[PDB]
């Protein structure tokens, strides 16, 4: 929160706070209509900035804000989990029942796309990559991944049943472990940054 | 534009020591006025702070208790009243006013309380 | 009660060369550091009020450099009177001053 002098230069107006820098600006208890952020403090400055007409005082006030997790963990975190986990638990199903896994597959990458398009439209339209935005496309990727990889068990059914069951009871463990993995490692940096 | 303070005091430990700071050129409600002591040679440490126009003082944690900030606006000067003097506050008292970017720009000419026997 | 680190603590030089003195703070004082010159058995005479704005009457020799924690002073062509002490002092909460520093001739 810059203010300053228009019109006035420094040679003219100048600013300065009336009691002491940290306790001049001074934030209310009840005064909090944030639901989304938490105010940790404010920080106060001064100095002078540098015109096509002059230089001015310009005193400057910042608002640390910390945004609160809780909304977006029910709202996109643990969905996304869930429907991973609801992707992976098509592995114990037998071989035998293909439109029970392809369905599984199908309508979880179904639930993925409807999770991304309404975790899409919370966050405002930037034109880079947020921790969300890998985490969905990490989900994103073991759900597809879950399917290609039904499809290649059920692709070396009927010609070698010993390699599909061998990559299916293999692929029963390997996506849990990974995905525990990259869970630990996403919440480890994203958590203690 | 100038600060005047008292001369050295040479007290007994125990009693009580009254330090004045008078002000010529300015009006010493439109400023803070603030009290400093150094002890011989160390660094400076700030006692506390009265704002006259209002009457509201802060003091330091190490002072809170022992020293008293008054001010009487009618001749321009700053009272600085220490209740109870040990044997180690021998250091000079400094008298300064804030200045333009929160600094102490005018200071006083010093005030060495001594305490002895 | 922000500290206030100043460093070195005694210090020697000579004549005509270029000398850096430096505060480091706890908390964050924005540009609100101060730096004092102190002869001794004098009052002490602001040098940089604020981060970086020299007072009225100070040679162009003093420079400061400010941040949000670090804090330097900078002077150039030193001269023969600056056999003095050397403090910084925060002035964003109530004023803490740093250990001083001792400029001598050698």
């Known amino acids: 929160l810059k203010f300053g002098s228009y019109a006035y230069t420094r040679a003219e107006v100048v600013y300065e706070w009336t009691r002491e820098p940290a306790r001049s600006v001074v934030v209310a208890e009840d005064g909090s209509r944030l639901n989304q952020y938490d105010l940790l403090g404010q920080t106060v400055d001064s100095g002078i900035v540098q015109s096509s007409t002059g230089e001015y005082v310009v005193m400057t006030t910042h608002f640390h804000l910390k945004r609160k997790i809780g909304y977006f963990v029910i709202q996109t975190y643990l969905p996304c989990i869930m429907t991973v986990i609801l992707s992976q638990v098509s592995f114990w199903l037998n071989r035998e029942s293909v439109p029970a896994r392809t369905v599984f597959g199908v309508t979880t990458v179904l639930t993925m796309t409807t999770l991304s398009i309404s975790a899409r439209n919370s966050l405002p339209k930037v034109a880079y990559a947020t921790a969300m935005d890998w985490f969905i496309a990490v989900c994103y990727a073991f759900v597809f991944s879950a399917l290609i990889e039904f499809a290649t068990v059920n692709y070396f059914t009927k010609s070698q049943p010993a390699r599909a069951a061998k990559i299916d009871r293999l692929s029963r463990i390997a996506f849990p472990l990974l995905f525990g993995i990259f869970n630990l490692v996403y919440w480890a940096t994203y958590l203690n940054r | 534009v100038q600060l005047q303070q008292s001369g050295a005091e040479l007290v007994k430990p125990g009693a009580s020591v009254k330090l004045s700071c008078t002000a010529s050129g300015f009006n010493i409600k439109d400023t803070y006025m603030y009290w400093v002591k150094q002890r011989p040679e160390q660094g400076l440490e700030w006692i506390g702070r009265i704002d006259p126009a209002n009457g509201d003082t802060k003091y330091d944690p190490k002072f809170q208790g022992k020293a008293t900030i008054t001010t009487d606006t009618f001749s321009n000067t700053a009272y600085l009243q220490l209740s109870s003097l040990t044997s180690e506050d021998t250091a000079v008292y400094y008298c300064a006013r804030k200045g333009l970017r929160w600094a102490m720009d005018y200071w006083g000419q010093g005030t060495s309380v001594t305490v002895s026997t | 009660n922000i500290v206030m680190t100043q460093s070195p603590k005694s210090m020697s030089m000579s004549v005509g060369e270029r000398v850096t003195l430096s505060c480091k703070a706890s908390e964050y004082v924005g540009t609100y550091v101060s730096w004092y010159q102190q002869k001794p058995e004098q009052s002490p005479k602001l040098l940089i009020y604020?981060?970086?704005n020299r007072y009225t009457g100070v040679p162009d020799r003093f420079t400061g450099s400010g941040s949000a924690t670090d804090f330097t002073l900078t002077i150039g062509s030193v001269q023969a009177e600056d056999l003095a002490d050397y403090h910084c002092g925060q002035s964003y909460s109530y004023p803490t001053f740093g250990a001083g520093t001792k400029l001598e001739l050698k």
């Open positions: 604020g981060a970086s």
